[PDB]
Motif scaffolding. Sequence first.
Motif, PDB file in Angstrom:
ATOM      1  N   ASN A   1       0.849  -1.228   0.000  1.00 53.44           N
ATOM      2  CA  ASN A   1       0.000   0.000   0.000  1.00 53.44           C
ATOM      3  C   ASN A   1       0.867   1.254   0.000  1.00 53.44           C
ATOM      4  O   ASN A   1       1.255   1.755   1.060  1.00 53.44           O
ATOM      5  CB  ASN A   1      -0.914   0.011   1.226  1.00 53.44           C
ATOM      6  N   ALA A   2       1.155   1.764  -1.193  1.00 56.08           N
ATOM      7  CA  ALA A   2       1.999   2.949  -1.344  1.00 56.08           C
ATOM      8  C   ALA A   2       1.420   4.225  -0.729  1.00 56.08           C
ATOM      9  O   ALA A   2       2.164   5.116  -0.299  1.00 56.08           O
ATOM     10  CB  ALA A   2       2.300   3.178  -2.820  1.00 56.08           C
ATOM     11  N   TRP A 123      -4.642   5.625  -8.520  1.00 57.24           N
ATOM     12  CA  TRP A 123      -5.734   5.522  -7.565  1.00 57.24           C
ATOM     13  C   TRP A 123      -6.906   6.393  -8.013  1.00 57.24           C
ATOM     14  O   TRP A 123      -8.057   5.955  -8.001  1.00 57.24           O
ATOM     15  CB  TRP A 123      -5.259   5.979  -6.192  1.00 57.24           C
ATOM     16  N   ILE A 124      -6.609   7.632  -8.395  1.00 55.31           N
ATOM     17  CA  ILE A 124      -7.634   8.561  -8.857  1.00 55.31           C
ATOM     18  C   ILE A 124      -8.336   7.976 -10.075  1.00 55.31           C
ATOM     19  O   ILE A 124      -9.559   7.843 -10.104  1.00 55.31           O
ATOM     20  CB  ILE A 124      -7.028   9.917  -9.286  1.00 55.31           C
ATOM     21  N   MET A 125      -7.540   7.642 -11.087  1.00 51.23           N
ATOM     22  CA  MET A 125      -8.050   7.074 -12.324  1.00 51.23           C
ATOM     23  C   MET A 125      -9.063   5.997 -11.986  1.00 51.23           C
ATOM     24  O   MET A 125     -10.116   5.891 -12.612  1.00 51.23           O
ATOM     25  CB  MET A 125      -6.907   6.448 -13.128  1.00 51.23           C
ATOM     26  N   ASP A 126      -8.739   5.207 -10.974  1.00 50.84           N
ATOM     27  CA  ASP A 126      -9.595   4.121 -10.555  1.00 50.84           C
ATOM     28  C   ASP A 126     -10.902   4.581  -9.914  1.00 50.84           C
ATOM     29  O   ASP A 126     -11.974   4.125 -10.313  1.00 50.84           O
ATOM     30  CB  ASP A 126      -8.833   3.219  -9.587  1.00 50.84           C
ATOM     31  N   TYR A 150     -11.573   7.480   3.044  1.00 50.72           N
ATOM     32  CA  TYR A 150     -10.548   6.975   3.950  1.00 50.72           C
ATOM     33  C   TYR A 150     -10.374   5.484   3.710  1.00 50.72           C
ATOM     34  O   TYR A 150      -9.284   5.009   3.413  1.00 50.72           O
ATOM     35  CB  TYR A 150     -10.960   7.192   5.400  1.00 50.72           C
ATOM     36  N   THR A 151     -11.465   4.749   3.852  1.00 53.16           N
ATOM     37  CA  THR A 151     -11.445   3.314   3.645  1.00 53.16           C
ATOM     38  C   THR A 151     -10.831   2.997   2.287  1.00 53.16           C
ATOM     39  O   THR A 151      -9.915   2.188   2.182  1.00 53.16           O
ATOM     40  CB  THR A 151     -12.867   2.751   3.702  1.00 53.16           C
ATOM     41  N   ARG A 152     -11.341   3.643   1.247  1.00 50.13           N
ATOM     42  CA  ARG A 152     -10.841   3.419  -0.098  1.00 50.13           C
ATOM     43  C   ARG A 152      -9.324   3.528  -0.142  1.00 50.13           C
ATOM     44  O   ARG A 152      -8.661   2.731  -0.788  1.00 50.13           O
ATOM     45  CB  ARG A 152     -11.442   4.441  -1.053  1.00 50.13           C
ATOM     46  N   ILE A 153      -8.778   4.516   0.553  1.00 49.50           N
ATOM     47  CA  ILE A 153      -7.331   4.734   0.586  1.00 49.50           C
ATOM     48  C   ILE A 153      -6.537   3.630   1.281  1.00 49.50           C
ATOM     49  O   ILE A 153      -5.654   3.018   0.688  1.00 49.50           O
ATOM     50  CB  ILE A 153      -6.978   6.055   1.310  1.00 49.50           C
TER      51      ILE A 153
END
Length: 155
Positions: A1-2, A123-126, A150-153
């Motif tokens: 998780n970058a 991540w955004i693209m997604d 938050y969760t998504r991150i």
Amino acid sequence: NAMQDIHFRRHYVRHLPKEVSQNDIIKALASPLINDGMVVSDFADHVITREQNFPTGLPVEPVGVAIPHTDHKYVRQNAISVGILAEPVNFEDMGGEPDPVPVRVVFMLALGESNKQLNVLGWIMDVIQDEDFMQQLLVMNDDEIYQSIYTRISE
């Protein structure tokens, strides 16, 4: 998780009122980062200049998105500040297309290292292709948007 090093807090989310300009939006989203010391005091103006020179509008459907940001020398701690606009606001197409992008959701990115860009963009693209997720951002309250992003991150 970058993105484990990206800071995202409850006050990094907010709905903005109608009649706000691109500059107001940028100053409003930058405010919390500036106060937490995540970025330099005049971060909002560097973002503004950057946006005018290299626009960050993403013409995705049905919710237009923008990813304003600036040089990493102005960021001392990675973070993301999210804004939900009351009405669409025009951002120039990052791709150079003539039609402006009617933006409703703004993801201000404050990245302190360029090696973080690919990952964060990926991540955004997604998330912007996740129709349902994006639509929900237009309906949920701040706490809900916060929990979901938050969760998504982290998850």
